[PDB]
């Protein structure tokens, strides 16, 4: 839990190079660097674009205690996907009114725990989960999960009708509608369809006699400004007219990749090399912080380009990270830089990866510092854990 200061004369280059310098003789392990200042900048960007929507960060993207701490400090909510996650979040001191579980497939022990912890807002996408919801937690607040027109997930309109009917029979309170619109999608009209489906529920549940006050729009954000700008350019004209401020509407979002993906940088070491075109082996790979390849460009540390393939330390056939790259001749002991290493790169240390986890380094700028200080955040009690220098 330590973040170093940075002035205009200093850059990420010198902290990277220094960590490289000290790691070269010591542990020789990889290193992670995360910019919280860009997270705060993205919160200010969010408030700039649309402030009437409360973001609920998906923990599966990054579950490091630091990020969760500063996000709880920002007032940003939490989207949960596991009970250990809910345990850590509740242990931190987060209010249950700003907690949501997201996993598409719930278990009985998990929902008993959710009931015991006092969290009532949860989503659902089938009749079985609704059945167990009614079976174990009669006072749960239900968000209906719908499908999108983009292997499959969500609930059809007819089955949504059946869901609200059964929920009415099972005396459970439905409060809103849930969906997800991927970051990759650029087809605007699609969103309309989704929203139309929500309107359907707004009618049907409205006809059955239940109170609606919350809309979840998902977490499909890349992180760049123009993306969110187009997002508002499509959503804002339609949203203010169907649910204006004062209609009792509380809009919710669940950003995950958005805040951290391009916020993190990974420094890696080379351990092997083979000449066939060349093939090179690192000390890490897909079996660790590179799961995101299943669903972004390397740069050379040192000061003639050849095509080559990347392999990890597992040496097995599945450990391909990049199919083809261009790089100058290198040897064992050199360093490699990877940008955009925030999306699903953090996992827990165990036998799965030989009890090996990269170090945790954090960066913060003076500008972002005065930007948090004037907001009255740095003075509250919930951050007694912080240590900055």
């Amino acid at each position: 839990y330590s973040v170093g200061l940075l002035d205009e004369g200093t850059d990420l280059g010198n902290v990277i190079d220094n960590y490289v310098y000290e790691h070269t003789l010591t542990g020789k392990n990889a290193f992670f660097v995360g910019d919280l200042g860009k997270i705060v900048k993205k919160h200010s960007q969010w408030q700039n674009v649309v402030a009437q929507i409360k973001p609920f960060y998906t923990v599966k993207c990054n579950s490091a205690p630091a990020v969760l701490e500063i996000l709880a400090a920002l007032g940003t909510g939490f989207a949960c996907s596991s009970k250990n996650e809910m345990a850590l979040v509740q242990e931190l001191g987060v209010p249950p009114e700003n907690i949501i579980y997201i996993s598409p497939c719930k278990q009985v022990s998990q929902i008993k725990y959710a009931a015991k912890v006092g969290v009532n807002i949860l989503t659902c996408d089938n009749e079985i989960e609704l059945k167990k919801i009614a079976r174990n937690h009669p006072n749960a607040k239900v968000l209906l999960h719908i499908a999108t027109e983009d292997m499959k997930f969500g609930t059809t309109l007819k089955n949504c009708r059946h869901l609200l009917e059964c929920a009415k029979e099972l005396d459970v309170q439905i409060i809103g509608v849930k969906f997800h619109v991927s970051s990759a999608c650029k087809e605007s009209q699609v969103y309309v369809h989704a929203l139309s489906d929500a309107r359907c529920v707004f009618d049907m549940a409205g006809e059955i006699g239940f109170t609606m006050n919350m809309l979840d729009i998902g977490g499909g954000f890349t992180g760049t400004e123009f993306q969110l700008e187009e997002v508002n350019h499509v959503i804002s004209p339609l949203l203010d007219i169907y649910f204006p401020e004062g209609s009792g509407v509380k809009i919710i979002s669940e950003p995950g990749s958005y805040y951290v993906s391009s916020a993190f940088t990974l420094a890696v070491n080379i351990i092997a090399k083979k000449v066939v075109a060349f093939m090179y082996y690192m000390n890490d790979g897909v079996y660790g912080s590179f799961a995101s390849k299943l669903s972004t460009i390397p740069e050379v540390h040192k000061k003639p380009l050849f095509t080559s393939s990347l392999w990890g330390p597992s040496c097995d056939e599945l450990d391909q990270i990049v199919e083809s790259c261009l790089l100058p001749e290198l040897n064992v002991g050199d360093w490699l830089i990877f940008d955009n290493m925030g999306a699903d790169s953090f996992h827990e240390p165990s036998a799965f990866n030989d009890f090996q986890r990269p170090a945790i380094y954090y960066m913060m700028s003076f500008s972002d510092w005065y930007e948090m200080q004037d907001a009255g955040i740095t003075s509250d009690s919930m951050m007694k854990n912080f240590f900055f220098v």
């Binding site: 996907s81 596991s82 009970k83 250990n84 996993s103 598409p104 497939c105 278990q107 009985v108 022990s109 725990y113 996408d125 089938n126 009749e127 079985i128 989960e129 167990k132 292997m151 499959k152 997930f153 897909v286 079996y287 799961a291 299943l294 669903s295 597992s314 097995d316 056939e317 599945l318 996992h347 036998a351 799965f352 990866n353």
Partner: protein, 94 residues
């Protein structure tokens, strides 16, 4: 429609072997009740996915169980059968 899926239980840990090709509809409910039954009567402490390496929907199922909550397990684990021609995902309980 009735759907047959090959699934094998051993050592208090459940292993699911998925056949090649796409899934039939209502499969969400299928693995749902699969997990419900995995907890209620047979009381599994861990659920596991295994499937053939060489397919065009590897990433699809990987991301599928990824969203479902499963995590990647490297071949060579004591609880994993020694078979290098299969990909493996895992979801652990409490």
């Amino acid at each position: 429609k009735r759907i047959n899926w090959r699934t094998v239980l051993s050592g208090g840990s459940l292993y699911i072997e998925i056949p090649g090709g796409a899934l039939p509809e209502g499969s969400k409910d299928s693995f749902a009740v699969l997990l419900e039954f995995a907890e209620e009567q047979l009381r599994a402490d861990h659920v596991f996915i295994c499937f053939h390496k060489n397919r065009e929907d590897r990433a699809a199922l990987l991301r599928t169980f990824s969203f479902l909550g499963f995590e990647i397990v490297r071949p060579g684990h004591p609880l994993v059968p020694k078979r290098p021609d299969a990909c493996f995902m895992a979801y652990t309980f409490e």
